[PDB]
Amino acid sequence: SHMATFVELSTKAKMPIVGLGTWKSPLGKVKEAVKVAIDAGYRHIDCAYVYQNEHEVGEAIQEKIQEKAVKREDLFIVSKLWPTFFERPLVRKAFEKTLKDLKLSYLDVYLIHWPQGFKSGDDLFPKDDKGNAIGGKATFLDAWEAMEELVDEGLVKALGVSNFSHFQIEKLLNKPGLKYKPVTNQVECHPYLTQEKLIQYCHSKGITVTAYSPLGSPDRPWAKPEDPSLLEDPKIKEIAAKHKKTAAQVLIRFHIQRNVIVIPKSVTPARIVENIQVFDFKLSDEEMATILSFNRNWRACNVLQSSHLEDYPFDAEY
Numbered sequence: 001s002h003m004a005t006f007v008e009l010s011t012k013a014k015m016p017i018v019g020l021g022t023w024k025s026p027l028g029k030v031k032e033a034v035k036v037a038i039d040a041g042y043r044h045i046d047c048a049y050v051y052q053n054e055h056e057v058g059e060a061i062q063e064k065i066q067e068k069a070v071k072r073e074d075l076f077i078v079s080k081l082w083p084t085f086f087e088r089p090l091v092r093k094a095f096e097k098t099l100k101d102l103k104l105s106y107l108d109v110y111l112i113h114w115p116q117g118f119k120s121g122d123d124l125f126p127k128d129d130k131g132n133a134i135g136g137k138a139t140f141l142d143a144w145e146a147m148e149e150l151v152d153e154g155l156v157k158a159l160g161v162s163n164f165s166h167f168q169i170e171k172l173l174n175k176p177g178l179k180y181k182p183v184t185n186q187v188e189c190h191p192y193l194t195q196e197k198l199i200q201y202c203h204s205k206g207i208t209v210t211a212y213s214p215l216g217s218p219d220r221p222w223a224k225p226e227d228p229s230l231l232e233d234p235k236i237k238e239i240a241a242k243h244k245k246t247a248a249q250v251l252i253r254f255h256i257q258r259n260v261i262v263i264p265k266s267v268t269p270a271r272i273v274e275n276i277q278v279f280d281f282k283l284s285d286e287e288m289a290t291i292l293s294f295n296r297n298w299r300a301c302n303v304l305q306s307s308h309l310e311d312y313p314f315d316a317e318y
């Protein structure tokens, strides 16, 4: 029986500092992964419309609620709005699909998944004849307006953003008539991409950070063998040995000690349990400084080529 520390959001809601990632968790494996996580004591599950598995997540959650293994109010369910759905009627239709698949009556956090709006229609990844991403009509500020309505209606408890630079968050925080502030910014982060300035900025604004791909996303389709590999880094494994822990557990604990929420994905029952066993050790200040020194400014998750649309987040220094 495990419990992740709570990080307090600006709304006073309590967000578990470790959650289960579900990107690439296949149909036919994700349902069990979520059951196992809930049995182990995970309460935060990270989800998205684009992962196309929310209905199996919804099945797992419903079954554990019926079983009385957990109550809804102790779960913390996060989903995201995909940028082909920024137009107002579409915000509400995409949201309703996620909430239906997940079989819930409310979400704990709903995120803008990426800051650039894309052409609406059937394709999730609309591209021109040359394969460049096609921009849409509505901006992330337009979508945010429609998302605030969901909070007014009691269907989402808090809103947040993902893949935002500080410039894009400034634009949001400065929007005229802003009703709700983002409670987290979910971005890639790990010892090869330490995000020092973006974390400093977010915290200074009362915005949490959620670290995605904290293990280096080894299962990402575009991985190349010469790409840095955190889980095989010998200096990470050495610090791990010193604490009698795995590299993955050190990689998860790194974020916990910076007060950054972290969402490792697994569909392997043993690794699910291993990844939440991270509250029985502490990395020394020396060890934190060493791990922080590994920054390479390297992004594993840098596939959208959309740097020719406005609001490309990764051109900014942070």
Ligand SMILES: NC(=O)c1ccc[n+]([C@@H]2O[C@H](COP(=O)([O-])OP(=O)(O)OC[C@H]3O[C@@H](n4cnc5c(N)ncnc54)[C@H](OP(=O)(O)O)[C@@H]3O)[C@@H](O)[C@H]2O)c1
Binding pocket: 020, 021, 022, 023, 024, 046, 047, 113, 162, 163, 186, 187, 211, 212, 213, 214, 215, 216, 217, 218, 219, 231, 246, 248, 249, 263, 264, 265, 266, 267, 268, 271, 272, 274, 275, 301
């Ligand atoms: N907002 C965004 O744009 C965005 C982008 C990327 C990710 N995310 C979210 O962040 C979550 C985590 O990132 P990610 O899926 O990219 O990658 P990740 O969590 O860095 O790595 C997942 C990979 O590591 C393996 N793994 C898990 N625990 C392990 C352990 N203890 N030892 C060894 N290997 C282990 C998993 O294998 P098995 O599954 O086979 O065990 C899987 O191949 C995602 O699933 C998603 O929910 C969000």
